[PDB]
Swiss-Prot record:
Subcellular location: Cell membrane
Gene Ontology CC terms, in alphabetical order: plasma membrane
Pfam families reported in the protein's UniProt record: MBOAT
UniProt-recorded name of the protein: Teichoic acid D-alanyltransferase
Summary of the function given for this chain in its UniProt record: O-acyltransferase that catalyzes D-alanylation of both teichoic acid and lipoteichoic acid (LTA). D-alanylation of LTA plays an important role in modulating the properties of the cell wall in Gram-positive bacteria, influencing the net charge of the cell wall. Catalyzes D-alanylation from DltC carrier protein.
Phylogenetic placement of the source organism: Bacteria, Bacillati, Bacillota, Bacilli, Lactobacillales
Organism: Streptococcus thermophilus (strain ATCC BAA-250 / LMG 18311)
């Protein structure tokens, strides 16, 4: 039972160049299919199940049961609420369902911070899969989503390319994208896009992520640890080198995911948009890990602001935002894991955003004052842009040093 699947080979999803040979052959019939407006549902299900299983059949291949459990568990609570929301709509039934849907994820995250081991509920894609599930409970709550097949739901939820850690997606647009197969040239354009993406991914993940991550980072950490203190010039090195490695590996992955998704005929959400040339903290979050970023924006932040408006709990328009920023970014930190440095990374980006949002209000009223004063509006050239970039780039790189937990190694290994 547990025995056979540990005797089946492990394929790290987008792990090497060779992975793309197998997946390529695999997807080829699906793609050719899309040219004749046909899909092959059973074949699609088989090939999805294979690559998910192969991603999960490590030395700890037990997680396939954890996935099996999870799939069943979600079917219960999604249908539990679907059947319920037909007739009655209540605040507290909603919360309980929402909690129960995120409950397996909470337990996975809470487990190493209580025993120092993994939950048996844990499987690779869990932290990203939960968004797809919760999303539906949220969308059904607001009555923007009503009818859907168990198939439609399961397709969307365990979509293979974006499974391991891929772009988060929402049901309504995924389903609508899957419904209508794109015309011959529009579809051929995707194939062009996919090779472009794959080749670029190769450069990022297999070359640059390798240069930063495994050639430059390990001696710089050895340097900074043997130096000691609260900070040092090698620790400034680790900060920049790690940040780039984190970028190239994750953005490289994301392109692979995007490309493979394209060969399946659906264009999944994008994750990065030159995030370093961002001049602003607000702009950075419109450019970095966008699928996640935008998810928290609509399903955590916007929904918190709405409930704080509902009671008008806070004095003014500015404290309600600033609280919600800090809460939203803290929950995001929590989602990464319950360690000091993840929560630290969270509150950092919160105060980071409030500082930013405050200056935007202030800068607006300096221009307002200047207009009445008769002066020219505050300078907006290339040097000002360059300055903004310098601020945020360094803010953001510093945040990644917190996020790496190298600071925990530098300070607390005692």
């Amino acid at each position: 039972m547990i025995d056979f699947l540990k005797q089946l080979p492990h394929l790290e999803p987008y792990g090497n160049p060779f992975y793309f040979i197998y997946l390529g052959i695999a997807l080829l019939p699906i793609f050719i299919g899309l040219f004749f407006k046909k899909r092959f549902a059973i074949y699609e299900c088989l090939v999805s199940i294979t690559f998910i299983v192969l991603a999960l059949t490590g030395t700890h291949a037990s997680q396939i049961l954890a996935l099996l459990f999870y799939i069943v568990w979600q079917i219960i609570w999604v249908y539990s609420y679907k059947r319920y929301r037909s007739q009655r709509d209540n605040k507290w039934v909603f919360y309980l369902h929402s909690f129960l849907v995120v409950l397996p994820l909470i337990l996975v995250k809470v487990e190493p911070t209580i025993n120092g081991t993994q939950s048996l509920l844990n499987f690779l894609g869990i932290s990203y899969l939960t968004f797809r599930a919760v999303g539906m409970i949220i969308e059904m709550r607001d009555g923007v989503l009503k009818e859907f097949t168990l198939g439609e739901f399961l397709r969307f939820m365990l979509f293979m390319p974006t499974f391991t850690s891929g772009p988060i997606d929402r049901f309504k647009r995924f389903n609508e994208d899957y419904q209508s197969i794109p015309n011959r040239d529009e579809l051929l354009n995707m194939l062009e896009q996919a090779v472009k993406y794959i080749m670029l991914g190769f450069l990022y993940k297999f070359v640059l992520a390798q240069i930063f991550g495994s050639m430059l980072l390990p001696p710089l950490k050895a340097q900074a640890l043997s130096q000691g203190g609260i900070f040092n010039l090698p620790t400034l090195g680790v900060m920049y080198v790690y940040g780039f490695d984190l970028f190239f590996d994750f953005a490289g992955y994301s392109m692979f995911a995007l490309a493979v998704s394209n060969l399946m005929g659906i264009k999944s959400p994008i994750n990065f948009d030159k995030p370093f040339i961002s001049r602003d903290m607000k702009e950075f979050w419109n450019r970095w890990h966008m699928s996640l970023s935008f998810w928290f924006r609509d399903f955590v932040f916007m929904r918190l602001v709405i409930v704080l408006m509902r009671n008008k709990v806070f004095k003014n328009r500015n404290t309600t935002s600033n609280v919600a920023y800090i809460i939203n970014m803290m929950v995001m930190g929590f989602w990464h894991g319950i360690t000091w440095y993840y929560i630290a990374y969270g509150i950092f980006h919160g105060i980071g955003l409030v500082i930013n949002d405050a200056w935007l209000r202030k800068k607006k009223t300096i221009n307002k004052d200047r207009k009445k004063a008769g002066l020219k509006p505050l300078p907006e050239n290339k040097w000002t842009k360059a300055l903004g970039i310098f601020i945020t780039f360094n803010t953001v790189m510093l945040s990644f040093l917190i996020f790496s937990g190298f600071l925990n190694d530098l300070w607390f290994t005692k």
